[PDB]
């Protein structure tokens, strides 16, 4: 079974270093090219770098955006591939995939006739200066401006927490229909914020109790916020 699996990612402060690693199995690591690709959360793939096989003396190359900062090391005796990232920036935050490169029609040599046939799990690297912080839970209260002809919307705003994630339920899990918990956004301050909404019959406001349960385990914060009409 050909397998690539990465590790070593973490939360790193800006300016620091971090070494991610890729363990291979099922194939001779020294005989293939090995690339590093990265993907910022909610965006596309970005080719980071390449380390050549033994026939090409393990020479490395990198994209211009990490060229003066990233380095590749190969320990083929232990089937390990290390990506050393120094002087990390905020934009370096991404999932880093280790990738095996295979050549087709190799009778023609080592040209552009290559693909990436095996991708690893990827390891998340986040470059931030924020420290662990529990969130504040504010009510998005239903009102006339939150009604659409029998339907009302209410919810909770879980603001200023680090790091991810928080979990949100409604009425201890009793309420599921009409619930939309949105993926968090990263604010300019380096803290996360998300919204959790539910649409209910407007005739149920004032007579039915709605509670949002928020749990941010990294800070062991747990809150039950009642949302009342405005």
């Amino acid at each position: 079974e050909v397998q690539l699996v990465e590790s070593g990612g973490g939360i790193v402060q800006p300016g620091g270093s971090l070494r991610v690693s890729c363990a291979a199995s099922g194939f001779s690591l020294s005989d293939h090219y090995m690339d590093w690709v990265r993907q910022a959360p909610g965006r596309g793939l970005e080719w980071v770098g390449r380390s050549r096989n033994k026939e090409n003396s393990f020479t490395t190359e990198f994209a211009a955006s990490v060229r003066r900062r990233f380095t590749i090391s190969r320990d083929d005796s232990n089937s390990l591939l290390h990506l050393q990232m120094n002087n990390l920036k905020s934009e370096d935050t991404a999932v880093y995939f280790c990738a095996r490169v295979g050549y087709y029609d190799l009778w023609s040599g080592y040209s552009g006739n290559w693909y990436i046939d095996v991708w690893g799990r990827g390891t998340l690297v986040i470059v931030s200066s924020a420290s662990t912080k529990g969130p504040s839970v504010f009510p998005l209260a239903p009102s006339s401006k939150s009604t659409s002809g029998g339907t009302a919307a209410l919810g909770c705003l879980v603001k200023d927490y680090f790091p991810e994630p928080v979990t949100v339920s409604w009425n201890s899990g009793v309420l599921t229909s009409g619930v939309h918990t949105f993926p968090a956004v990263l604010q300019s301050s380096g803290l996360y914020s998300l919204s959790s909404v539910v649409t209910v019959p407007s005739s149920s406001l004032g007579t039915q109790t709605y509670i949002c349960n928020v749990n941010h385990k990294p800070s062991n914060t747990k809150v039950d916020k009642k949302v009342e009409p405005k």
Binding site: V37, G44, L45, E46, W47, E61, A63, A64, F97, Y104, G112, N113, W114, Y115, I116, D117, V118, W119, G120, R121, G122, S136, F138, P139, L140, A141, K145, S146, T147, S148, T151, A153, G155, L157, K159, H180, F182, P183, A184, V185, Q187, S193, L194, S195, V197, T199
Partner: protein, 213 residues
């Protein structure tokens, strides 16, 4: 150097349809174009190399074509596992680059969003911040324009939005947009509105409130 542009960025179809994804290079590159498939939360999967050659194990309903600056990936008899994002990647010359990706999503009938506004709560106002929230509920297609207006002044850059994944049940989207001001900045204005434009609305829908009420 070489930049890949994929079109369209979002594609919708049903089971059994045949979809086509276009990848255009800014300069000619023979046929050194590979196609990968990625689903949310998982690593990319190698699909096609050399523009038209299938990797062993890939179902024959996938096909590729193209040379020079334009390439296409076609999926016939679309299956449930085919709904994902697809990326082209040129192997022609360093530095190697990927396309922006194209989402193959579940097509359904158009549905206009339900728009709601939430003023900042008094509890957040005691802290020193004010977050106004605008919610678009259960709409399709995803293309929608949300505009924040403060006293008829268009806000640009001081808000952030978030879009859920396509619903597994009714295949619609939902959007949340937060406009965060500081408390003295919030107290200096009166009217706060979000204006929503979408294919399902007869006209732009504006939801607004005054800081008083």
């Amino acid at each position: 150097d070489i930049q890949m542009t994929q079109s369209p960025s979002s594609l919708s179809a049903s089971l059994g349809d045949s979809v086509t994804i276009t990848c255009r290079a800014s300069q000619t590159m023979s046929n050194f174009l590979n196609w990968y498939q990625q689903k949310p939360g998982k690593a990319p999967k190698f699909l096609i190399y050399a523009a038209s050659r299938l990797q062993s194990g890939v179902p024959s309903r996938f096909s590729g074509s193209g040379s020079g600056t334009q390439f296409t990936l076609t999926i016939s008899n679309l299956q449930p596992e085919d709904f994902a994002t697809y990326y082209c990647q040129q192997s022609f010359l360093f530095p190697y680059t990927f396309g922006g990706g194209t989402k193959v999503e579940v097509e359904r009938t158009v549905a206009a969003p339900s728009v709601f506004i939430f003023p900042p709560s008094d509890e957040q106002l005691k802290s020193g911040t004010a977050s106004v929230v605008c919610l678009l509920n259960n709409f399709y297609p995803r293309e929608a324009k949300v505009q924040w207006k403060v006293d008829n002044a268009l806000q640009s850059g001081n808000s952030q939005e978030s879009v859920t994944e396509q619903d597994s049940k009714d295949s619609t989207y939902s959007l949340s947009s937060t406009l965060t001001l500081s408390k003295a900045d919030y107290e200096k204005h009166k009217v706060y509105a979000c204006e929503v434009t979408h294919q399902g609305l007869s006209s732009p829908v504006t939801k607004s409130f005054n800081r008083g009420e």
